[PDB]
Design a protein around this ligand. Sequence first.
Ligand SMILES: CO[C@@H]1[C@@H](n2cc(-c3ccc(Cl)c(F)c3F)nn2)[C@@H](O)[C@@H](CO)O[C@@H]1Cc1cn([C@H]2CCOC[C@@H]2F)nn1
Length: 138
Amino acid sequence: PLIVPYNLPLPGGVVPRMLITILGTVKPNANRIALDFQRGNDVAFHFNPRFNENNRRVIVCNTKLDNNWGREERQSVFPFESGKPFKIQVLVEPDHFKVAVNDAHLLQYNHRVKKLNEISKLGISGDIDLTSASYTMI
Ligand SMILES: CO[C@@H]1[C@@H](n2cc(-c3ccc(Cl)c(F)c3F)nn2)[C@@H](O)[C@@H](CO)O[C@@H]1Cc1cn([C@H]2CCOC[C@@H]2F)nn1
């Protein structure tokens, strides 16, 4: 295991065809997970599984600019289960981040932050046991 929160450097930011893989286990009584792809203090892509928002499980995605959250993009398709080993894969494409969980496509999120080569950190936080975080080019 690795201790959460964890910062994964993304040197020289991201680029199309870069695949970022996060492996871990969801804690048994999990409430929340967050991935924060950051450009300095801005959050280009915040991917936020919520296990109990008004008794529903939802994925919330957004962008934070100058410390202000933007318009939320939401998904009720919710592939995580408490207590289980997961894999989140974020593939950077030219116009969006594409997310698959456990080898099943989940969602796309259009790039709001345009300076891909400045999105130089992935913060990983919340109710997980983190096994590894890495990247490759496809
Ligand atoms: C409660 O904070 C979350 C944010 N958040 C969540 C976390 C976090 C912290 C720690 C761990 Cl361990 C962890 F998993 C985490 F998710 N930190 N900040 C974030 O999820 C944003 C995503 O939009 O929503 C909330 C904040 C929020 C949303 N809105 C509006 C935006 C326009 O639409 C209507 C909304 F009201 N204004 N503020």
